[PDB]
Task: structure prediction
Amino acid sequence: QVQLQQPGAELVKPGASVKLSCKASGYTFTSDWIHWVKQRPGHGLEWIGEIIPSYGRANYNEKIQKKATLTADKSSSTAFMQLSSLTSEDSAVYYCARERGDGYFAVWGAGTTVTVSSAKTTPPSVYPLAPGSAAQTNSMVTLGCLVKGYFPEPVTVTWNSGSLSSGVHTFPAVLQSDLYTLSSSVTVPSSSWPSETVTCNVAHPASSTKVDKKIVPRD
Amino acid sequence: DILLTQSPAILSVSPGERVSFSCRASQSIGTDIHWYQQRTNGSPRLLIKYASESISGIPSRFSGSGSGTDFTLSINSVESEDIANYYCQQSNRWPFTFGSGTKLEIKRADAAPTVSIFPPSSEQLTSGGASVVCFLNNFYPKDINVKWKIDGSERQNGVLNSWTDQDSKDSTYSMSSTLTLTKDEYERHNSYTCEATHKTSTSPIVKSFNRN
Result:
C-alpha cells in the first residue's frame, strides 16, 4: 500500500500560509523520522527539516530562511508542514519522506505541488484529438487529448484508467495569460481503434476535478 | 555542513554500455552515502544505501562503490528506463544533505519523427475557440523544427511549442506544436499544414488537413 499520502496541489496567495499534510501508513516505529524536501521546477532536492512523531521534536535546515513549521499527530499518523508568508520563491513540489532513523529515505510521498500566485483556480477543458478524414495510417494510429485553460499545475493524464501506458507521452504545460495548456499523446495498433475504446482521464487536484474524454472517429 | 559534488551534471552513453556517476563529499563520511533515482515527473526512489548495499526490487545492474570522500553509482548496461536524474545524499553528519544531481542521457540511433495533425474538436468550436494540434513523436536527436502554413502561407502567431524530456521508454524525444485561433479566424481559412524538419531527411515531413 502507498506508504505516504500527500494532496496533489495547493494554491496560495502571496503572503498567505498553507499547511501541507502527509498521511502515513505501513509499519510505524518510535524511531521513525518524517522529513520534508523541497524541489523547485528544474532544480535539485533541498532538505527543509525533519520531525520525530514519537517525541514531537523538529529540526530545520539552518542554511535557508525558515518558512516551515513541522508538527505531527500520532493518533491520525499524520505529519504537517506549515509554510508561512509565501512568495513566488516558495513555489515548488514539496515531498515528505520517511526515515527509520538509519539515515536514508526508504519511502517518499508523491509530493504536493505548491503554487504561490494571485490568479484563480481554473479547471481544464478536455478536447479529443482524432485524425481528420484524409489522414492515412499504418499499423499504428495516434490519438490525443488537449487539456486547456487550467490553473494551477499540475494535471495528471492517464489512458484507459491506467491500463494503457505503452505508446503514451504527455507534454509539459505551456503557460499563457495565467492559464496552462498541454496535450497527451497515445499510440495503439490501428486495427484496435475504434473497436476497442480509448479514453483519456484528466485529474486536476487543485480544483478537485477528474474528467473522462472518450476518443471517437470524427463523424 | 557536508557538501556533495556530483560532476558531471550530464552523462551521455550508448545503450548497453556501463555508466558511472560520481559523488564527492567535502569531508570523509565513511560509507554513509545513499543513492536515489528520479524520473521525469516522479518522486525519488532509493537505489543503493550505505554506498554499496542493494535494495530490494532494484535491478541488479545497479551497484554502488566507494568510501571516504569519493563514491560511485554504476549501471552495468544502460537501458531506456534508466533515463532519469540521480542524486546522492549523506547521513554521516547533521544535517543530511543532497548532491546537486546527475542526468543520464542515452545516445540511441537516429529516428525520424512520426508526425500527426489534428483539427479542432467540435466541442472546442462551440466555445468560440479553435486549436490545431500537431505531434512530432519519437524522434532522435532532439533538435527539430516545426513550421505552420495556412492556405500555403507561413503562420507564426498563435503557435506554442512544448518538448518532452528524453523518453524512458525508447530514449527518443517528442514535441507538440499548437496553433490557437478564434473560431472566426479558423473559419476564414481552408488549409492547415504542419511541417517537420529533422536531420533524418533532407525534405520536410508534411501533414495537412482541410477545414472542409
